Design a protein around this motif. Sequence first.
Motif, PDB file in Angstrom:
ATOM      1  N   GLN A 128      -5.693   1.715   3.333  1.00 65.63           N
ATOM      2  CA  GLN A 128      -4.974   3.078   3.057  1.00 65.63           C
ATOM      3  C   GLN A 128      -5.565   4.403   3.574  1.00 65.63           C
ATOM      4  O   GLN A 128      -5.276   5.171   4.228  1.00 65.63           O
ATOM      5  N   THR A 153      -7.553  -0.714  -0.078  1.00 65.89           N
ATOM      6  CA  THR A 153      -8.080   0.821   0.183  1.00 65.89           C
ATOM      7  C   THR A 153      -8.308   1.014   1.349  1.00 65.89           C
ATOM      8  O   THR A 153      -8.369   2.273   1.867  1.00 65.89           O
ATOM      9  N   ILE A 191       0.661  -1.186   0.102  1.00 63.50           N
ATOM     10  CA  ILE A 191      -0.016  -0.067  -0.012  1.00 63.50           C
ATOM     11  C   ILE A 191       0.851   1.135   0.084  1.00 63.50           C
ATOM     12  O   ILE A 191       1.753   1.376   0.841  1.00 63.50           O
TER      13      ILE A 191
END
Length: 152
Positions: A111, A108, A41
């Motif tokens: 993230q 995500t 990431i």
Amino acid sequence: HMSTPARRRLMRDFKRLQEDPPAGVSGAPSENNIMVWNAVIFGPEGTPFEDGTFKLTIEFTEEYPNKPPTVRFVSKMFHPNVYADGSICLDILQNRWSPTYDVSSILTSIQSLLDEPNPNSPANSQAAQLYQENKREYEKRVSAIVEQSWRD
């Protein structure tokens, strides 16, 4: 592999990640074990984690996608919701997992977590304290681990 619903779904997760990755994420099954993935990431832009390249591992069981995998940072991390051993407190991994989430949405979500710590899960007490009380010093610590993430 293709022998089980979990394995076929993981291969479909891998296909989506190869051909259409979200910005700043990557992941692939381990060479010998489709149940264990390596992922990377990139820290979200406009955050202290920008320019970080963080490795993680993800371990699945045959219950996937009905049970979330275990995700750990491998790279060093400094974040209120990440334990010293890399374990992550993420609500979709602990309380509101849905079989519709895949490797992409997990990556995500982590993230997004880097940008916006959850104040309910202070796994790294110093990180939560600096985040709460001293953003400049928090970001100095994050900058250190951003720079360290350029080294495996």
